[PDB]
């Protein structure tokens, strides 16, 4: 049995084609779990800022009575909401109470089977913080479990890849304990905001043949295996795999893992930001690029004039697939599925070419 754990965001709907995504877009039967990315936090309360929000609620209910083993997530963190956005609510118990409440009803009026704190990150600053909260949450879910006829409340975690956030920010034995399962962020572990500032793939299944000492660290494979190691249960471990690609701009001729850049690749033009592409903005690049597969790290990246982009593919997915069977994780976990080609129109590969290959390599015998 293997989970397939699928977020999606809220703001995908504001992209033209072939980026325009609803929750009309998803699949029932493509992922066991679905998690919305983000709910926010109000008077210490929780919501949805989402101008479809009601409309959210129809589909949720619709993907569920398609299919009834389907489990719906609620999300809260992410990239931008950071550690501030936690602010006041996990000041006091008292306030951190009001929110447990809070979600416990949202979720239950809504149709949700869970909630996903993804903290990004807590750090040393935070570690007490994110480890009550969980705590609290857990224990929350359990008692209202003890009084439900419906399922326990889920309660899983996006977390660091990175060894030493991850040793500064998690109590790794208390987590297992608390979460179903983690999330494993499994990617961003290069891109253009590193100094110097040099290519390098936004996630290497293993390491580079430059990578020594700590720089071995930033990959895949390190971060699944230093999980298990600090404590946490493989299956309990679901393995981040992205659907979009890290870009660099290139300073010089060189156009190798390493090669110095002068800043962050040419923004798509769907998505609009400079230093990443979705897979459906990278089937476009790829049109003319020069394609290399990393015989050390196992995925490829691509250049063409001066752009670099580091990025997964099919043959990633497979990959990646084999690996987690390999080490007895829980499944795979997708950031996000509203970036794979899932119209089909780009890729030419049919709808979500990179979800339905991790589906496809999860299933088969
Ligand atoms: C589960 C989780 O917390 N994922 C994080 C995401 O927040 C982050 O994606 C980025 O989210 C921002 C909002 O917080 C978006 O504005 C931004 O477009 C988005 N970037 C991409 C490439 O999807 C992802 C990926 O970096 O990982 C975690 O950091």
């Known amino acids: 049995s293997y989970k397939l754990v699928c977020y999606f965001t809220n703001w995908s709907q504001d992209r033209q084609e072939p980026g325009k995504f609803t929750p009309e877009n998803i699949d029932p039967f493509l992922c066991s779990h679905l ?51 936690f602010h006041p609510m996990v000041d ?10 809070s979600i416990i009803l949202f979720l239950r009026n809504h ?15 935070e570690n007490t913080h994110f480890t009550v909260l969980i705590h609290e949450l857990a224990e929350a879910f359990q008692k209202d479990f003890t009084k439900s006829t419906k399922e326990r409340l889920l309660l899983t975690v996006g977390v660091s890849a990175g060894r030493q956030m991850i040793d500064n920010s998690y109590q790794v034995e ?22 110097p500032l040099i290519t390098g793939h936004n996630s290497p299944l293993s390491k580079g043949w430059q990578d020594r000492g700590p720089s071995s660290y930033y990959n895949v ?10 404590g946490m249960p493989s299956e309990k471990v679901v393995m981040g795999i992205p659907t979009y690609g890290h ?14 850049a002068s800043g962050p690749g040419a923004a798509g033009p769907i998505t609009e930001s400079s230093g990443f592409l979705a897979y459906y903005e990278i089937c476009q690049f790829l049109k003319g690029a ?25 043959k990633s997915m497979e990959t ?24 089909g129109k780009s890729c030419n590969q049919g709808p979500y070419p990179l979800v339905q290959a991790v589906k496809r390599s999860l299933g088969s015998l």
Do not use: C
């Open 290 to 314: 020069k394609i290399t597969w990393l015989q050390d790290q196992q995925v490829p990246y691509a250049v063409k004039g001066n752009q670099w982009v580091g990025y997964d593919d099919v």
């Open 111 to 125: 149709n949700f089977d869970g909630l996903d704190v993804s903290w990004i990150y807590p750090d040393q600053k």
């Open 247 to 260: 870009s660099f701009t290139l300073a010089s001729a060189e156009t190798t893992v390493g090669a110095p």
């Open 320 to 343: 990646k697939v084999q690996f987690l069977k390999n080490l007895n994780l829980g499944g795979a976990m997708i950031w996000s599925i509203d970036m794979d080609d899932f119209t």
């Open 92 to 101: 006091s118990s008292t306030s951190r109470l009001e929110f447990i409440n």
């Open 174 to 195: 208390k987590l297992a304990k608390d979460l179903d399962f983690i999330n494993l962020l499994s990617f961003d572990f290069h891109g253009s905001w590193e100094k």
């Open 35 to 85: 998690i919305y990315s983000f709910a926010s936090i109000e008077n210490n309360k929780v919501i949805i800022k989402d101008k479809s929000e009601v409309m959210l609620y129809q589909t949720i209910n619709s993907l569920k009575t398609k299919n009834p083993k389907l489990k719906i997530l609620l999300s809260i963190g992410g990239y931008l909401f950071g550690s501030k956005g």
């Open 221 to 230: 494979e390190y971060a699944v295996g230093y999980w298990i190691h600090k």
